[PDB]
Amino acid sequence: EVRTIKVFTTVDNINLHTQVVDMSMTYGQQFGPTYLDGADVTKIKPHNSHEGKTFYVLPNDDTLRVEAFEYYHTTDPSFLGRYMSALNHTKKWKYPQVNGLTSIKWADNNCYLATALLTLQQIELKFNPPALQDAYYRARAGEAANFCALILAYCNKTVGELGDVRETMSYLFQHANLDSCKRVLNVVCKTCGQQQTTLKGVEAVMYMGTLSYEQFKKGVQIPCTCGKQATKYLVQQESPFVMMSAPPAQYELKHGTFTCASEYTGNYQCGHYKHITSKETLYCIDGALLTKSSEYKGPITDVFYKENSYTTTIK
């Protein structure tokens, strides 16, 4: 007795492709790797309840390859399976609204993702891949499962792996439209003279070495080939935010002098991030947890500042 059902395959969950599946055969035999809202059904035979449902499949023909690239801006063959494997976990996480922002309840070492997500909602940033546009829209609304699985997929992190907030933001920024952002720096060494530099896109909004925007504007000290220490300062900046980063160090955060920041406690193998946002007062969001204070000291790794246009007074 031959029994079949109609299902739809997809790579982007928007464009659907009609299929008829033989119920005596697994999905894998008919589609290759197959997933149902993140669950791997490759080795599963079709069920009655599957009629009319949508299954993700790996791009196995030209139409799916193009739809997948256009949606995700990647051709990495393992991407889709990594997105699905993550989604199967992020689906089960909780996304409380904490002080008006979508957070994530702690699970599976995801503190780095909560503080990244809380940060995004505080800076002006538009994603390029439609997958991130759509999923970020839902995350802002409270349904962040797909966005978090996508972050994992894009950063090649699996659920449970310890992450780095700076590295994660780097990947997110890579997939954002920062074409307008420009940075000008000058470096003065008393043996080599001076050198000016211009940076664009991601490199225009990220700096590694100091947490303080003001200190960047006045000068910091870096090594030279000559052997002397030079001074680097910020000549001009064009961007809606800047991110300053440093190895974690005790650092004092003053209300109203920054947008938000990330705090890291522990060591390189394992530790814990928390998020500090400056609103009417200082709020610390630790996943689902919230505390407040008027002043804050702690081991800060990243600080985010607002910006529009800045020209250095320094002659």
Residue ranges of the annotated binding site for Zn(2+) are 189, 192, 224, 226
Work out how close the CB of 208 gets to Zn ion at its nearest, in angstroms, rounded to a whole number. 21
Q: Does 72 bind ligand A5I (CB under 6 A)?
A: yes
Which listed range, 154-162, 209-217, 224-232, 249-257, lies at the site for Zn ion (CB under 5 A)? 224-232
Q: Does 59 bind ligand A5I (CB under 6 A)?
A: yes
Rounded Cα–Cα distance for residues 252 and 264 (Å): 14
Work out how close the CB of 77 gets to ligand A5I at its nearest, in angstroms, rounded to a whole number. 4
Q: Which residue in the set 52, 61, 77, 227 belongs to the binding site for ligand A5I (CB under 6 A)?
A: 77
Of 154, 84, 142, whose CA–CA distance to 117 is shortest? 142
Question: Interaction with Cl ion in 115-154: which residues (CB under 5 A)?
Answer: 126-127, 133, 136
- Residue 79 touches which of Cl ion, Zn ion, ligand A5I, none (CB < 5 to 8 A by kind)? ligand A5I
- Residue 226 touches which of Zn ion, ligand A5I, Cl ion, none (CB < 5 to 8 A by kind)? Zn ion
Beta bridge partners of 98: 101
Work out how close the CB of 254 gets to Cl ion at its nearest, in angstroms, rounded to a whole number. 31
At residue 147's C-alpha, the angle toward residues 292 and 122, to 5°, is 35
Rounded Cα–Cα distance for residues 33 and 199 (Å): 42
H/E segment holding residue 170: helix 165-174
Q: Is 111 a catalytic residue?
A: yes
Collapsing DSSP to helix, strand or coil, 37 comes out as coil
Work out how close the CB of 139 gets to Cl ion at its nearest, in angstroms, rounded to a whole number. 10
Supply 3's token pair. Answer: 């029994």
Work out how close the CB of 73 gets to Cl ion at its nearest, in angstroms, rounded to a whole number. 13
Cβ-proximal residue to Zn ion, closest one? 226
Rounded Cα–Cα distance for residues 80 and 297 (Å): 41
- Residue 71 or 216 having the CB closest to Cl ion: 71
Q: Which residue in the set 75, 191, 293, 311 belongs to the binding site for Zn ion (CB under 5 A)?
A: 191
Of 304, 286, 300, whose CA–CA distance to 248 is shortest? 300
Q: Which residue in the set 224, 235, 246, 288 belongs to the binding site for Zn ion (CB under 5 A)?
A: 224
In Å, the largest CA–CA distance within the chain is: 88
Q: Give the dihedral of Cα atoms 106, 112, 113, 117; nearest 10 deg.
A: 110
Catalytic residue among 111, 148, 155, 284: 111
Helices assigned H by DSSP within 100-155: 111-120, 130-141, 145-155
Q: Does 229 bind Zn ion (CB under 5 A)?
A: no
Q: 145-155 and 165-174 are packed helices; what angle lies between their axes, rounded to 10 degrees? A: 90
- Residue 68 touches which of ligand A5I, Zn ion, Cl ion, none (CB < 5 to 8 A by kind)? ligand A5I
- Residue 74 or 122 having the CB closest to ligand A5I: 74
Catalytic residue among 17, 73, 255, 272: 272
Q: Is 286 a catalytic residue?
A: yes
Supply 22's token pair. Answer: 């033989």
- Residue 189 touches which of ligand A5I, Cl ion, Zn ion, none (CB < 5 to 8 A by kind)? Zn ion
Asked whether 142 and 197 are in contact (CB, 8 A), the reply is no
Rounded Cα–Cα distance for residues 272 and 34 (Å): 35
* Residues labelled catalytic: 111, 272, 286
Residues that bind Cl ion (CB under 5 A): 126-127, 133, 136
Residues that bind Zn ion (CB under 5 A): 189, 191-192, 224, 226
